[PDB]
């Protein structure tokens with residue numbers, strides 16, 4: 313069992329470099345628009361007035377490069393916290409795509425990029441406190457997170473900042489931040505994070521579908537008793553929605569959702585006692601019910 | 607610190623579907639040759655005479671589809687355990703590439719494919735027992751592993767089989783097996799695996815170069831004394847070469863390798879005791895020194 317990312321080729325053909333003044337970062341070039349974080353126009357960083365910063369720019373202040381080719385910016389506008397640079401040329405490599413806003417617990421692939429060129433790809437989850445536990449470099453802003461389903465790329469994240477705890481914060485591709493964050497270098501802190509309970513359960517089901525049943529037991533639990541216990545370990549409350557979502561995996565393994573909840577309760581109480589589940593010595597929470605079935 | 611795969615775009619455009627009679631798997635289309643496991647011509651599998659089975663085949667026995675378009679096979683050829691299907695057209699998406707054979711303990715990215723279509727990418731290490739702890743579907747054969755070095759794709763692995771323990775075995779792209787395995791259906795087992803010591807040290811350096819310091823101590827050991835410790839815990843012997851190739855990581859953050867070996871020596875007896883390292887609670891051996899520095 314591997315945390316697998318989506319093949320990155322469709323996204324690679326979209327990454328460009330955007331430079332404004334002394335700042336360069338990455339942009340996403342789809343059709344004839346380049347999307348990048350609006351803070352590329354900052355020098356300024358504690359209290360930027362982006363409306364005032366932007367009206368003073370003209371098209372030639374934005375240097376956009378796709379590989380060796382410089383694209384000509386013919387217009388620009390701001391949509392929430394993303395800048396949209398209109399360019400003279402449509403990206404010939406534009407894939408089928410959509411912009412989607414995800415909820416906490418969702419997973420996606422990140423194409424980490426620097427100077428417009430892709431560096432690596434890895435799988436991420438949106439944490440319950442709306443941060444990402446990413447691996448992001450000095451000039452990684454504008455790198456995007458995405459899923460691919462039937463040749464259609466769903467762009468769900470664009471990178472903007474690193475919080476002082478070392479986790480990461482960013483926006484959807486319409487420029488709205490995930491979580492209570494703003495593009496200012498002001499004191500802001502991520503809420504206390506929690507473990508994604510529905511994902512841990514999905515992964516225990518994956519463990520059952522593959523090798524192992526050693527963590528199962530003879531007990532069941534009510535939903536409320538499970539939540540009362542699990543929250544004492546900083547697990548997210550499990551909702552009826554989550555119970556419904558786990559239905560197909562329950563049906564496939566013959567283990568009722570509340571029976572798997574009993575197993576998780578005991579795993580939290582006992583630990584794993586030198587054993588491993590799918591390859592892990594910790595309870596994994598970055599695989600969704602959807603990810604397991606695939 | 608995340609396990610990062612190479613961006614897979616350059617390889618995605620080489621993946622095709624090969625069907626022979628009843629069996630479908632993946633092929634690698636480079637220039638005017640498609641490469642795939644020779645066991646695609648089996649039905650038979652318990653002891654094949656591949657030369658005999660191949661002379662019985664003709665070009666039209668091989669159905670090669672590059673997505674929508676069928677490629678016409680105009681020649682067929684075996685090299686060790688890989689079949690070479692000459693097709694009428696050079697792949698216009700052929701990247702700069704070479705065929706390389708890797709050493710146990712080296713890492714690479716796997717592009718898992720099914721029906722000739724890329725499905726996921728992840729980072730792998732070649733185990734000391736020459737197996738791969740992969741994630742491979744029913745029709746994953748022909749999927750490849752690779753590294754990228756400045757526009758050149760170095761192919762090092764093509765997938766052939768799953769051993770009874772659930773680990774995986776394959777060849778290089780010249781058809782030579784990694785490990786003491788053969789392409790026939792028969793009892794074969796992986797040799798007892800060991801842990802890749804130099805990679806564990808690199809991962810520890812990835813923690814000190816990062817932030818963590820709590821496994822560090824004031825002490826040092828000898829290569830001989832450390833190698834006596836490695837044996838009880840089934841760790842690969844640390845060679846004067848490994849120490850040297852780590853030297854660039856020692857030199858940087860002020861920790862001699864044998865200084866970090868003293869830390870690893872104590873870790874092999876104390877455990878973590880609730881503390882992570884980079885962001886994990888087990889000694890990780892799938893990052894090379896080059897993987898950490900890059």
Ligand SMILES: *C(=O)[C@H](C[C@@H]1CCNC1=O)NC(=O)[C@H](CC1CCCCC1)NC(=O)c1cc2ccccc2[nH]1
Nearest residue numbers: 645651742744745746747766767768769770789790791
């Ligand atoms: C190719 O697509 C598959 C990939 C396997 C399938 C499941 N997971 C994988 O990685 N390859 C096979 O199925 C081979 C078939 C060839 C092997 C070499 C000789 C000719 C046929 N079979 C196995 O990998 C296999 C069979 C088997 C039976 C019992 C225990 C383990 C086991 N592994």
Ligand SMILES: O=C[C@H](C[C@@H]1CCNC1=O)NC(=O)[C@H](CC1CCCCC1)NC(=O)c1cc2ccccc2[nH]1
Nearest residue numbers: 351357448449450451452453472473474476495496497
């Ligand atoms: O790519 C550029 C970086 C990405 C960062 C850098 C290191 N790792 C990353 O993910 N973005 C940035 O550096 C912007 C700077 C800022 C954003 C808000 C509006 C004004 C400009 N981000 C920041 O993450 C940041 C600054 C900072 C200062 C003190 C403590 C934590 C901090 N984090």
